[PDB]
Design an enzyme around this catalytic site. Structure first.
Site, PDB file in Angstrom:
ATOM      1  N   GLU A 283       5.107  12.728 -45.220  1.00  0.00           N
ATOM      2  CA  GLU A 283       5.735  13.848 -44.788  1.00  0.00           C
ATOM      3  C   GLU A 283       6.340  14.427 -45.935  1.00  0.00           C
ATOM      4  O   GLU A 283       6.376  15.655 -46.143  1.00  0.00           O
ATOM      5  CB  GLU A 283       6.946  13.420 -43.810  1.00  0.00           C
ATOM      6  CG  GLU A 283       6.452  12.876 -42.603  1.00  0.00           C
ATOM      7  CD  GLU A 283       5.185  13.531 -41.766  1.00  0.00           C
ATOM      8  OE1 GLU A 283       5.319  14.916 -42.163  1.00  0.00           O
ATOM      9  OE2 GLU A 283       4.569  12.879 -41.310  1.00  0.00           O
ATOM     10  N   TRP A 286       3.613  16.603 -47.664  1.00  0.00           N
ATOM     11  CA  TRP A 286       3.462  17.678 -46.879  1.00  0.00           C
ATOM     12  C   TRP A 286       4.182  18.959 -47.326  1.00  0.00           C
ATOM     13  O   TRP A 286       3.914  19.952 -47.626  1.00  0.00           O
ATOM     14  CB  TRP A 286       3.552  17.566 -45.421  1.00  0.00           C
ATOM     15  CG  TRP A 286       2.399  17.320 -44.816  1.00  0.00           C
ATOM     16  CD1 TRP A 286       1.821  16.171 -44.045  1.00  0.00           C
ATOM     17  CD2 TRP A 286       1.145  18.338 -44.248  1.00  0.00           C
ATOM     18  NE1 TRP A 286       0.709  16.274 -43.671  1.00  0.00           N
ATOM     19  CE2 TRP A 286       0.158  17.527 -43.793  1.00  0.00           C
ATOM     20  CE3 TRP A 286       1.221  19.776 -44.659  1.00  0.00           C
ATOM     21  CZ2 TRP A 286      -0.823  18.255 -43.627  1.00  0.00           C
ATOM     22  CZ3 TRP A 286      -0.132  20.383 -44.464  1.00  0.00           C
ATOM     23  CH2 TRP A 286      -1.095  19.625 -43.936  1.00  0.00           C
ATOM     24  N   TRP A 314      -2.931  41.636 -32.558  1.00  0.00           N
ATOM     25  CA  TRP A 314      -1.547  41.275 -31.700  1.00  0.00           C
ATOM     26  C   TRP A 314      -1.170  42.249 -30.558  1.00  0.00           C
ATOM     27  O   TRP A 314      -1.349  43.391 -30.600  1.00  0.00           O
ATOM     28  CB  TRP A 314      -0.477  41.028 -32.603  1.00  0.00           C
ATOM     29  CG  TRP A 314      -0.647  40.000 -33.705  1.00  0.00           C
ATOM     30  CD1 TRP A 314      -0.741  40.625 -34.959  1.00  0.00           C
ATOM     31  CD2 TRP A 314      -0.969  38.646 -33.663  1.00  0.00           C
ATOM     32  NE1 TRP A 314      -1.148  39.223 -35.868  1.00  0.00           N
ATOM     33  CE2 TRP A 314      -1.254  37.976 -34.899  1.00  0.00           C
ATOM     34  CE3 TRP A 314      -0.888  37.763 -32.535  1.00  0.00           C
ATOM     35  CZ2 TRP A 314      -1.585  36.779 -35.129  1.00  0.00           C
ATOM     36  CZ3 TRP A 314      -1.268  36.365 -33.005  1.00  0.00           C
ATOM     37  CH2 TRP A 314      -1.528  35.884 -34.277  1.00  0.00           C
ATOM     38  N   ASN A 349      10.580  18.534 -35.377  1.00  0.00           N
ATOM     39  CA  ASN A 349       9.363  19.144 -35.343  1.00  0.00           C
ATOM     40  C   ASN A 349       8.127  19.289 -34.546  1.00  0.00           C
ATOM     41  O   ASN A 349       7.543  20.404 -34.773  1.00  0.00           O
ATOM     42  CB  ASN A 349       8.828  18.326 -36.842  1.00  0.00           C
ATOM     43  CG  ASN A 349       7.279  18.732 -37.146  1.00  0.00           C
ATOM     44  OD1 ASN A 349       6.380  17.813 -36.784  1.00  0.00           O
ATOM     45  ND2 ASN A 349       7.117  19.801 -37.695  1.00  0.00           N
ATOM     46  N   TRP A 367       2.791  36.428 -35.482  1.00  0.00           N
ATOM     47  CA  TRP A 367       3.708  35.206 -35.898  1.00  0.00           C
ATOM     48  C   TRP A 367       4.794  35.580 -36.756  1.00  0.00           C
ATOM     49  O   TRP A 367       5.748  34.805 -37.035  1.00  0.00           O
ATOM     50  CB  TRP A 367       2.854  33.818 -36.322  1.00  0.00           C
ATOM     51  CG  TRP A 367       2.102  34.150 -37.538  1.00  0.00           C
ATOM     52  CD1 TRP A 367       0.651  34.368 -37.534  1.00  0.00           C
ATOM     53  CD2 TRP A 367       2.321  34.060 -38.818  1.00  0.00           C
ATOM     54  NE1 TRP A 367       0.267  34.289 -38.506  1.00  0.00           N
ATOM     55  CE2 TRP A 367       1.262  34.258 -39.536  1.00  0.00           C
ATOM     56  CE3 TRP A 367       3.651  33.730 -39.417  1.00  0.00           C
ATOM     57  CZ2 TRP A 367       1.243  34.285 -41.012  1.00  0.00           C
ATOM     58  CZ3 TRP A 367       3.608  33.845 -41.019  1.00  0.00           C
ATOM     59  CH2 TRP A 367       2.442  34.251 -41.543  1.00  0.00           C
ATOM     60  N   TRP A 390       4.122  28.186 -39.677  1.00  0.00           N
ATOM     61  CA  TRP A 390       3.906  29.605 -38.940  1.00  0.00           C
ATOM     62  C   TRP A 390       2.359  29.957 -39.107  1.00  0.00           C
ATOM     63  O   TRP A 390       1.458  30.327 -38.026  1.00  0.00           O
ATOM     64  CB  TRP A 390       4.515  30.624 -39.146  1.00  0.00           C
ATOM     65  CG  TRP A 390       5.871  30.640 -38.347  1.00  0.00           C
ATOM     66  CD1 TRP A 390       7.261  29.982 -38.692  1.00  0.00           C
ATOM     67  CD2 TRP A 390       6.360  30.618 -36.701  1.00  0.00           C
ATOM     68  NE1 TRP A 390       8.077  29.822 -37.768  1.00  0.00           N
ATOM     69  CE2 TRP A 390       7.446  30.366 -36.461  1.00  0.00           C
ATOM     70  CE3 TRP A 390       5.332  31.411 -35.752  1.00  0.00           C
ATOM     71  CZ2 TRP A 390       7.888  30.340 -35.261  1.00  0.00           C
ATOM     72  CZ3 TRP A 390       5.720  31.409 -34.436  1.00  0.00           C
ATOM     73  CH2 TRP A 390       7.328  30.888 -34.208  1.00  0.00           C
TER      74      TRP A 390
HETATM   75  C1  LIG Z   1       6.978  26.328 -37.240  1.00  0.00           C
HETATM   76  C2  LIG Z   1       7.604  25.421 -38.308  1.00  0.00           C
HETATM   77  C3  LIG Z   1       8.637  25.730 -38.895  1.00  0.00           C
HETATM   78  C4  LIG Z   1       9.158  24.966 -39.988  1.00  0.00           C
HETATM   79  N1  LIG Z   1      10.050  25.381 -40.729  1.00  0.00           N
HETATM   80  C5  LIG Z   1      10.638  24.517 -41.622  1.00  0.00           C
HETATM   81  C6  LIG Z   1      11.643  24.994 -42.308  1.00  0.00           C
HETATM   82  O1  LIG Z   1      12.290  25.963 -42.426  1.00  0.00           O
HETATM   83  N2  LIG Z   1      12.268  23.981 -43.015  1.00  0.00           N
HETATM   84  C7  LIG Z   1      11.924  22.627 -43.149  1.00  0.00           C
HETATM   85  O2  LIG Z   1      12.667  21.837 -43.923  1.00  0.00           O
HETATM   86  N3  LIG Z   1      10.832  22.228 -42.389  1.00  0.00           N
HETATM   87  C8  LIG Z   1      10.132  23.098 -41.633  1.00  0.00           C
HETATM   88  N4  LIG Z   1       9.128  22.728 -40.752  1.00  0.00           N
HETATM   89  C9  LIG Z   1       8.706  21.343 -40.908  1.00  0.00           C
HETATM   90  C10 LIG Z   1       9.902  20.832 -39.984  1.00  0.00           C
HETATM   91  O3  LIG Z   1       9.289  20.185 -38.713  1.00  0.00           O
HETATM   92  C11 LIG Z   1      11.068  19.909 -40.839  1.00  0.00           C
HETATM   93  O4  LIG Z   1      10.755  19.361 -41.947  1.00  0.00           O
HETATM   94  C12 LIG Z   1      11.781  19.091 -39.747  1.00  0.00           C
HETATM   95  O5  LIG Z   1      11.195  18.809 -38.443  1.00  0.00           O
HETATM   96  C13 LIG Z   1      12.497  17.838 -40.499  1.00  0.00           C
HETATM   97  O6  LIG Z   1      13.078  17.212 -39.778  1.00  0.00           O
HETATM   98  P1  LIG Z   1      13.820  15.752 -40.505  1.00  0.00           P
HETATM   99  O7  LIG Z   1      14.326  16.117 -41.848  1.00  0.00           O
HETATM  100  O8  LIG Z   1      14.423  14.646 -39.592  1.00  0.00           O
HETATM  101  O9  LIG Z   1      12.276  15.309 -40.951  1.00  0.00           O
HETATM  102  P2  LIG Z   1      11.589  13.952 -41.198  1.00  0.00           P
HETATM  103  O10 LIG Z   1      10.607  13.482 -40.228  1.00  0.00           O
HETATM  104  O11 LIG Z   1      12.776  13.040 -41.593  1.00  0.00           O
HETATM  105  O12 LIG Z   1      10.842  14.172 -42.622  1.00  0.00           O
HETATM  106  C14 LIG Z   1      11.587  14.160 -43.769  1.00  0.00           C
HETATM  107  C15 LIG Z   1      11.206  15.335 -44.782  1.00  0.00           C
HETATM  108  O13 LIG Z   1       9.875  15.629 -45.002  1.00  0.00           O
HETATM  109  C16 LIG Z   1       9.735  16.930 -44.974  1.00  0.00           C
HETATM  110  N5  LIG Z   1       8.784  17.438 -43.734  1.00  0.00           N
HETATM  111  C17 LIG Z   1       8.659  16.865 -42.673  1.00  0.00           C
HETATM  112  N6  LIG Z   1       7.639  17.599 -41.947  1.00  0.00           N
HETATM  113  C18 LIG Z   1       7.453  18.622 -42.595  1.00  0.00           C
HETATM  114  C19 LIG Z   1       6.214  19.520 -42.359  1.00  0.00           C
HETATM  115  N7  LIG Z   1       5.499  19.631 -41.316  1.00  0.00           N
HETATM  116  N8  LIG Z   1       6.202  20.557 -43.447  1.00  0.00           N
HETATM  117  C20 LIG Z   1       6.934  20.486 -44.482  1.00  0.00           C
HETATM  118  N9  LIG Z   1       7.941  19.446 -44.915  1.00  0.00           N
HETATM  119  C21 LIG Z   1       7.928  18.733 -43.797  1.00  0.00           C
HETATM  120  C22 LIG Z   1      11.184  17.611 -44.951  1.00  0.00           C
HETATM  121  O14 LIG Z   1      11.798  17.981 -46.042  1.00  0.00           O
HETATM  122  C23 LIG Z   1      11.819  16.550 -43.971  1.00  0.00           C
HETATM  123  O15 LIG Z   1      13.224  16.634 -44.307  1.00  0.00           O
HETATM  124  C24 LIG Z   1       8.489  23.719 -40.068  1.00  0.00           C
HETATM  125  C25 LIG Z   1       7.739  23.214 -39.310  1.00  0.00           C
HETATM  126  C26 LIG Z   1       6.988  23.934 -38.393  1.00  0.00           C
HETATM  127  C27 LIG Z   1       6.010  23.994 -37.413  1.00  0.00           C
END
Ligand SMILES: Cc1cc2nc3c(=O)[nH]c(=O)nc-3n(C[C@@H](O)[C@H](O)[C@@H](O)COP(=O)(O)OP(=O)(O)OC[C@H]3O[C@@H](n4cnc5c(N)ncnc54)[C@H](O)[C@@H]3O)c2cc1C
Ligand SMILES: O=c1nc2n(C[C@@H](O)[C@H](O)[C@@H](O)CO)c3cc(O)ccc3cc-2c(=O)[nH]1
Length: 475
Positions: A283, A286, A314, A349, A367, A390
């Site tokens: 993660e 990612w 759209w 997420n 979107w 998005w």
């Molecule tokens: C439509 C959409 C919008 C999103 N917008 C954001 C946003 O503005 N800010 C943001 O931090 N994340 C975003 N994400 C990813 C998002 O799901 C978050 O990182 C969030 O769920 C993290 O919660 P957590 O800190 O408990 O994650 P954990 O599961 O603990 O993951 C740890 C860290 O890994 C990173 N991470 C995890 N999943 C992703 C991912 N899919 N993409 C990028 N980084 C990731 C984050 O820094 C996160 O804090 C977005 C995802 C989607 C689908």
């Protein structure tokens, strides 16, 4: 020691494990920190009250850490292209240090500031800190950036990982004479949230500040992480770290986060654990994929990257958009997620993927409208990650994939099988039967005031596929 070195903070609000800060302390002990409240950012319609509230709490702590370390954090308000060089000139600073960013706004601002500092004969050093590997380090055998995660991951994962750097100590503050030279440029106090015109009472995934973020990392790693997989799938389960806003603002260093995951992974004797830990580590990968992407292809921020998606017709019915933003879609799993977002500034997420697919493929709304609504509410709002999420919902940017229109119903069944999360956010439906909440088919009598589906999923799926197929015939 010697003349003062200014370290400019923006999204790295901590004293620990800070690359640029550590490099600066090696040059002088008279290390002064600064943060510049930038109107171009704070006055944007893309601000979220939860996010400013989080930022404000991080700065309060940072002011204290600097005071405890021996110096101070200077606070300015205005245009950095103008205020930073002026402040440096007045203090005859030997250099100004800061950590590079990937955002177009940030990168343009930084170039202008650096240019201004050079003109003034002042050295500006910009280092990479927020990523384990810089965008320049991760390139293909041909020296090109990756637009697909797979190959990026194999490369990223094989690179030696850096270790956390030291926290600066024994700093020396500015003299009264120096303070006088800059007095007119300073803010006397950190403004409060109400002074900035915002209000937030919804809480946070993690409390603001370096100390809290670190406490949370340690805690997630002593227990939670082990179950990350598959606990991260279920929105009802507090299975994730809740560190997203700390990583957006750098309240915690990325090398400290990786190191903690490493340790945890070694002490773990259970192969299931070692897997949950490796899943969390991906993660973090990612996160870098999306940050490198915006760095290499800045145009991503403007909208659909893939040409055909730029021409997609759209429907954009405002009425459908409004119900979406208000959690009045009639699709339980969706409305429950939208309520969590607006009430707490955070959304699991899995739910972000579900509400995104819904807006794009069911409501058929560009979107970008969803991207902006998210930035206006998320405490962890981040251009790279949000834009990436998005574009994902439509496969219009990086790491594309074959079409796949989700069925909210199915997703609910899969991730909220018992409807625990749904009833948590939609109490007015606590009386309903899981089977009904998951299916979205609620009798007009037990479902109350609660709206009926604003659209018919199957009719929408065909409509979208049709618009999509017609288009494919002219690309
Ligand atoms: C439509 C959409 C919008 C999103 N917008 C954001 C946003 O503005 N800010 C943001 O931090 N994340 C975003 N994400 C990813 C998002 O799901 C978050 O990182 C969030 O769920 C993290 O919660 P957590 O800190 O408990 O994650 P954990 O599961 O603990 O993951 C740890 C860290 O890994 C990173 N991470 C995890 N999943 C992703 C991912 N899919 N993409 C990028 N980084 C990731 C984050 O820094 C996160 O804090 C977005 C995802 C989607 C689908
Ligand atoms: O230098 C600043 N950075 C701020 N940032 C932090 C950074 O994102 C950074 O300035 C840039 O690199 C963005 O391009 C904010 C980020 C938010 O999401 C919300 C508010 C801010 C506010 C500031 C600010 O006032 N000043």
């Amino acid at each position: 020691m010697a003349a003062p070195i200014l370290f400019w903070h923006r999204r790295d609000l901590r004293l620990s494990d800070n690359i640029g800060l550590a490099a600066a302390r090696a040059q002088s002990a008279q290390l002064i920190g600064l943060f510049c409240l930038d109107p171009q950012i704070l006055q944007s319609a893309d601000m979220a009250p939860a996010r400013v509230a989080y930022l404000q709490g991080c700065l309060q702590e940072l002011q204290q850490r600097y005071q405890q370390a021996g110096s101070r954090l200077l606070l300015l308000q205005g245009d950095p292209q103008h205020l930073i060089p002026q402040l440096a000139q007045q203090l005859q600073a030997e250099a100004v240090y800061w950590n590079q960013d990937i955002e177009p706004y940030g990168r343009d601002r930084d170039g202008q500031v650096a240019a201004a500092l050079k003109t003034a004969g002042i050295r500006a050093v910009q280092l990479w800190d927020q990523l384990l590997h810089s965008p320049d380090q991760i390139l293909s055998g041909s020296g090109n950036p990756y637009s697909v995660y797979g190959p990026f991951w194999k490369n990223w994962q094989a690179q030696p990982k850096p270790t956390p750097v030291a926290t600066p100590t024994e700093l020396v503050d500015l003299s009264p004479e120096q303070l006088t030279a800059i007095a007119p440029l300073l803010l006397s106090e950190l403004p409060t949230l109400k002074q900035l015109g915002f209000d937030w009472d919804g809480g946070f995934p993690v409390e603001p500040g370096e100390t809290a973020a670190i406490a949370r990392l340690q805690e997630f790693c002593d227990r939670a992480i082990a179950d990350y997989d598959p606990q991260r799938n279920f929105p009802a389960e507090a299975g994730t770290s809740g560190l997203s806003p700390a990583l957006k603002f750098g309240a915690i260093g990325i090398r400290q986060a990786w190191q903690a995951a490493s340790a945890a992974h070694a002490l773990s004797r259970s192969d299931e654990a070692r897997n949950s830990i490796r899943v969390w580590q991906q993660e973090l990968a990612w996160r870098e994929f999306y940050q490198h992407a915006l760095y290499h292809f800045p145009s991503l921020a403007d909208g659909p990257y893939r040409s055909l998606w730029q021409q997609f017709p759209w429907e954009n019915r405002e009425a459908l958009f409004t119900a979406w933003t208000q959690a009045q879609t009639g699709y339980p799993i969706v409305d429950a997620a939208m309520r969590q977002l607006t009430e707490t500034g955070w959304m699991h997420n899995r739910c972000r993927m579900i509400v995104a697919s819904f807006l794009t493929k069911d409501l058929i709304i560009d979107w970008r409208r969803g991207e902006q609504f998210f930035m206006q509410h998320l405490v962890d709002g981040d251009l790279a990650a949000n834009n990436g999420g998005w574009q994902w919902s439509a496969s219009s940017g990086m790491d594309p994939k074959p079409l796949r229109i989700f069925n909210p119903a199915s997703q609910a069944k899969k991730f909220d099988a018992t409807a625990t999360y749904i009833k948590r956010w939609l109490p007015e439906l606590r009386h309903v039967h899981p089977k009904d909440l998951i299916s979205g088919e609620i009798t007009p009598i037990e479902r109350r005031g609660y709206p009926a589906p604003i659209v018919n999923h199957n009719l929408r799926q065909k409509q979208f596929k049709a618009l999509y197929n017609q288009l494919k015939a002219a690309i």
